[PDB]
Design a protein around this nucleic acid. Structure first.
Ligand SMILES: [Zn+2]
Ligand SMILES: [Zn+2]
Lengths: 50, 63, 252, 77, 91, 112
RNA sequence: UUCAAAUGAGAACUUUGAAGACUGAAGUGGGGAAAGGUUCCACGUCAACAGCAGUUGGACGUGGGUUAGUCGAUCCUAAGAGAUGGGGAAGCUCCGUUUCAAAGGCCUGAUUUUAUGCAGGCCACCAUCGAAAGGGAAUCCGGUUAAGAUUCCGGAACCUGGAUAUGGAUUCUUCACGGUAACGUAACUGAAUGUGGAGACGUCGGCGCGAGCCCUGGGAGGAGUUAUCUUUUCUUCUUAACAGCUUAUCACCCCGGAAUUGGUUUAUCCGGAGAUGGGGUCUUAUGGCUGGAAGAGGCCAGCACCUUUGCUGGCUCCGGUGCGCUUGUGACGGCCCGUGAAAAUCCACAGGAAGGAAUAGUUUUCAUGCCAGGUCGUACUGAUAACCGCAGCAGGUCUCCAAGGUGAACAGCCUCUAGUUGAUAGAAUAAUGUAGAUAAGGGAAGUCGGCAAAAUAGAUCCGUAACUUCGGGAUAAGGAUUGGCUCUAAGGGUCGGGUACGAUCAACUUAGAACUGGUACGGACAAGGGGAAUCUGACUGUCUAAUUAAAACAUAGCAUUGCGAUGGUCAGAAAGUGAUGUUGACGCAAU
RNA sequence: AUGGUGAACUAUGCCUGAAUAGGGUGAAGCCAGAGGAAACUCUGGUGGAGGCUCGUAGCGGUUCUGACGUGCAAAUCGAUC
């Protein structure tokens, strides 16, 4: 790596944008059950297999 | 200081010798020096006229 | 049981020939008008090594009769040919070493090599180091020619079948002890994966018919029929005799 | 990048219609053992190459500087 | 001085492989590594590469030959035989 | 003793990743990548390195002018002068012996 | 590991400073390939995680950050994969990749109806994929960021593609001159077709040259030590790509003619096929000078600056040395039943199509000048915490650079640069342990068995048996010597001969003698126990990855067997299918 | 049994690349000298061969039947090889 395809990099960018916790205001909504973001993907714990 | 002493001739005995004679100075190196020397002396003499080409040839092959 | 070595050679994945450094196929010139009505002259430019082949090759250059260009051909070098030598090929070419003549045009006792089984195949017989066929008679009726091959077999070929005069170079090769496994290794890593060879007796029964036992033995006659089938043919196949060869063979 | 030895050629180079800028560098060197002289380098920047003329004599230098064109933008060091 | 009594060139194999094998190899390897006389230039500059190929250092001519000597007895017989046959036809 | 890196992204000591250690005006050692050395052009006949011609990689012969790539004989940057001499001699002499073969054949055949 | 301070609610662990230590240039250094994917950098921050702690963090949260005509992909082809045409197969699909195919384009004219047809001539091959290590157009320096840089800034260059004009060269001997020649010149027409070369290639050995490093002298500066000694110890004194001029072995030319045979390499090859020699031509790896370029960078001094952050002056010089180290390169030598890729791409030559002279036409391979150079990648780690191993696991995982001393040495031991100082700590010193050691006298009595450990150990000199395939055995066995100091001897280079030797310069190696020491000296480190014999396998080699490294396997050698292509052995569901076979009895196959 | 997925470990072949201190022995070839009636032999040097050897990096994995054996590790650690 570091000499990548654009396809690999494109997916890495979506994973950078997915790796954030909840917006706070979503907990405040009516009929809300989402307490936390389950699909977190730290680089130690779990590899995304590209 | 140790270099100056080794230059004078110190620390060069049998006890300060852990490699072989050939390892320290190869006999092929010694040969090459010797023969280059004799070879260029003969050449300079032949050029200067202190020796003719026939004696040059004899001495070249003897060397 | 399991499929054996000789069986899966035919699938031939890792048993293909190793052909990178081979200069090409050794082929005679295509039999055409000149070579069957007169002669064509060519020049030996290079005498070159061919990997996986003890015999050297000759890069011969001829002219195309029909287009202005030089067509190059790869002959197997007869012993004695040399760079800058003219090579004459055809019906009316002189009897000299390196020349390509028809075996009808040559006389009896003539020694040739790279000789066509039938006209046009561009060389089949007497192609390896030191080998030659002898011509031992003509039948000018029905344009045939009887010849001795290096195996001892007599054969009858068309008189129009071409053959290059002389013996193929590289002779004496198998006199020298190869003398070490590494040299056999380097021999065969330019030919094919036929080396090293393990013995059936040394392996297990799944792996070979000779395999098994509390001693290393075969147990059955190693002479095995021509009508045996694949997997059962792993000894001396269709052996009409066996043992040390004594006395005159080639009985006739 | 290219050294020039002839002042005629250098003057044409100045009057070459694509040379806009130039620079004059004064240096301090010595004449083979003894005394420090004063070296001058006239550098004109064409499109592809920088042409430089080395003049060891301040007299020729002074005449040449006045002999430059007027429209050329000269940077004295 | 003479350094080996009988092994010669095959002392590079030392103690290995057996005396008969080393002897056969000796006999052939001498011829192999020898210098031969050019039929063309008359000089003694013919050395082999690549068994069956004998090049002259001067003169740059390359001859097809034997594997460990330039000419085999068979090819000698062949050139003489072919000469006799050619002369039988035209002489 | 300053130590040095590959200035490119290939880390292997290949034939095309050759490295000269070179001092710079900043006083440091730096790797300088070396292009592959050029082979001399050769004669088609003799194989020798023929003289007068420049030693360049192939696509540089396009950059360079023609006096660098040819000498002023027939077969200039293609064949050696002695090779050219041989083939001139050969041409002339064989073309004379051709005439001689013609007249010999005529004087022989017209005997009867 | 320790001390102090700061920070903080709180400090064995954070930060800074001061010490003490390590890794010790086959590194705990600096870079990268795969892989990972933001772990990079900053700010904030400690609930969880970091098997103690935690104010710290590869954690948590919020953001920033990867800039290319020249680096690479891209393109080539390798082994090989894989369409088409055709053929098989109930079919999913298989074969096969140049084939039982009517498998297309390069130019020209025609010209101002011709759009691109038509009068012609040219060619034969016939997909595509396949290598961030193979091939390959072209870039360097200095500076710059919290984090990017051969990518940005500044400066200085080059390649390709395309437009183009001026100068120059050239012509009425219309497509140049000179040279005996090798060849040279800033240019100096040239299609189809053909030929050739470059691309483009093993490995080892030594010799030679170069670069960088190492070592070193003088001098200009700075720092350190200075009870005493030390013209002293450390440190800076640099110079890119590119361009021009010049420079080399090998090779070649001319003259000339060789035996009294000469020249000549460390290595013995060469010469009447034309030596030695005298004079020249060439390649331009490489080196030198100049430009680039000293205005840069580096080291200093002085002046200042509640700040921005500077200003002003100087120096940046001249050498040497070598079986040195690393690396490149050249010419050679040795080895092979092994003779050590292709293609894209570029050039040259042959040829003589066509066109062309002065009242201006040709040259866009000479010089200068004009425009443009896309897409994707680019941060970071690269490993005992950024990869894989369930993990921040003593495991595994491709490569580059590479200092001083000792010493044969990239060994071990110590050190400079650089980087770490991390691995839960404190207090005590019971048994039993793990790891390391020492032991009187004996000495293998121990044990199945000398298992384990000890002993030997480098180098110089001496001396060396049986047996033997004459090559070995063999470091056989077995003995002596080795420090420091002061001396001695020997071993060389370049210049000089008014047609026997002097002046000057610099290395290490070897041998010996005195003297000296509580007889110590390969003083640490490093570093073979040996001998007589049997069984067995010839040897080197290979295997049961995780209980068996062997006497097993393999091997060279020996022998047998089949096969002359309508073929032998083998494959495939079939096939206009296939491996052996780019083969042919000195071969292939099977034992 | 039907149908499918795997050569990232490992086995083997191919293609393309890379890596591999310092020492010992001292083979062919060559030089000189000595001897011989000749055939040819001896001595000293040079040279630097080898699926040679001591021994690093490395590649393996002998023995301690050592450590560990609810491990650092589902095969490692150390010394000896
Ligand atoms: Zn010859
Ligand atoms: Zn030639």
């Amino acid at each position: 790596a570091a000499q990548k395809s654009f396809r690999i990099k494109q997916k890495m960018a979506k994973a950078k944008k997915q790796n954030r916790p909840l917006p706070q205001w979503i907990r405040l909504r009516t009929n809300n059950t989402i307490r936390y973001n389950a699909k977190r993907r730290n680089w130690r714990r779990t590899k995304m297999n590209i | 200081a140790h270099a100056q002493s080794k230059r004078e001739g110190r620390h060069s005995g049998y006890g300060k010798r852990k490699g072989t004679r050939e390892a320290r100075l190869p006999s092929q190196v010694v040969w090459i020096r010797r023969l280059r020397v004799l070879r260029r002396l003969l050449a300079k003499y032949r050029d200067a006229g202190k020796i003719d080409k026939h004696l040059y040839h004899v001495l070249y092959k003897e060397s | 049981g399991r499929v054996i070595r000789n069986q899966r050679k035919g699938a031939g994945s890792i048993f293909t020939s190793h052909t990178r450094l081979r200069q090409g196929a050794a082929k005679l010139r295509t039999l055409d008008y000149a070579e069957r009505h007169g002669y064509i002259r060519g020049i030996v430019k290079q005498i070159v090594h061919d990997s996986g082949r003890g015999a050297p090759l000759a890069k011969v250059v001829f002219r195309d009769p029909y287009k202005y260009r030089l067509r190059e051909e790869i002959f197997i070098a007869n012993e004695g040919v040399h760079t800058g030598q003219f090579i004459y090929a055809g019906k009316k070419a002189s009897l000299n070493v390196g020349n390509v003549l028809p075996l009808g045009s040559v006389p009896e006792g003539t020694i040739v090599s790279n000789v066509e089984e039938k006209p046009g195949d561009r060389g089949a017989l007497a192609r390896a180091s030191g080998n030659y066929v002898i011509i031992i008679g003509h039948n000018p009726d029905e344009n045939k020619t009887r010849v001795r091959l290096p195996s001892g077999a007599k054969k009858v070929i068309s008189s129009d079948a071409r053959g290059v005069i002389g013996v193929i170079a590289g002779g004496g090769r198998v006199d020298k002890p190869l003398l070490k496994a590494g040299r056999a290794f380097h021999k065969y890593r330019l030919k094919r994966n036929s080396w090293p060879k393990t013995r059936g007796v040394a392996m297990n029964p799944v792996d070979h018919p000779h395999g098994g036992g509390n001693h290393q033995h075969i147990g059955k006659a190693s002479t095995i029929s021509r009508g045996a089938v694949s997997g059962q043919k792993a000894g001396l196949i269709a052996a009409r005799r066996t043992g040390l060869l004594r006395g005159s063979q080639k009985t006739q | 990048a290219r050294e020039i030895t002839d002042i005629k050629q250098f003057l044409e180079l100045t009057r070459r219609a694509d040379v806009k800028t130039a620079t004059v560098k004064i240096n301090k060197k010595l004449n083979k053992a003894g005394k420090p002289f004063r070296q001058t380098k006239f550098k004109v920047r064409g499109s592809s190459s920088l042409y430089t003329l080395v003049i060891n004599d301040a007299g020729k230098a002074k005449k040449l500087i006045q002999s430059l064109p007027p429209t050329l933008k000269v940077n004295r060091l | 001085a003479k350094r080996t009594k009988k092994v010669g060139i095959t002392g590079k194999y030392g103690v290995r492989y057996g005396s008969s094998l080393r002897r056969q190899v000796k006999k052939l390897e001498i011829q192999q590594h020898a210098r031969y006389d050019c039929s063309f230039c008359g000089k003694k500059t013919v050395k082999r590469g690549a068994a069956g190929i004998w090049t002259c250092s001067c003169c740059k001519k390359t001859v097809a030959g034997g594997a460990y000597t330039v000419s085999t007895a068979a090819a000698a017989t062949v050139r003489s035989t072919i000469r006799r046959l050619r002369e039988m036809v035209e002489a | 003793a300053q130590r040095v890196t590959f200035r490119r992204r290939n880390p292997y000591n290949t034939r095309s990743n050759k490295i000269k250690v070179v001092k710079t005006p900043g006083g440091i050692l730096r790797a300088q990548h070396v292009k592959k050395l050029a082979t001399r052009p050769k004669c088609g006949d003799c194989g020798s390195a023929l003289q007068g011609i420049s030693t360049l990689r192939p696509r540089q012969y396009a950059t360079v002018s023609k006096t660098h790539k040819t000498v002023s004989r027939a077969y200039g940057g293609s064949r050696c002068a002695n090779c050219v001499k041989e083939r001139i001699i050969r041409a002339f002499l064989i073309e004379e012996q051709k005439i001689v073969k013609k007249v010999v054949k005529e004087q022989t055949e017209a005997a009867k």
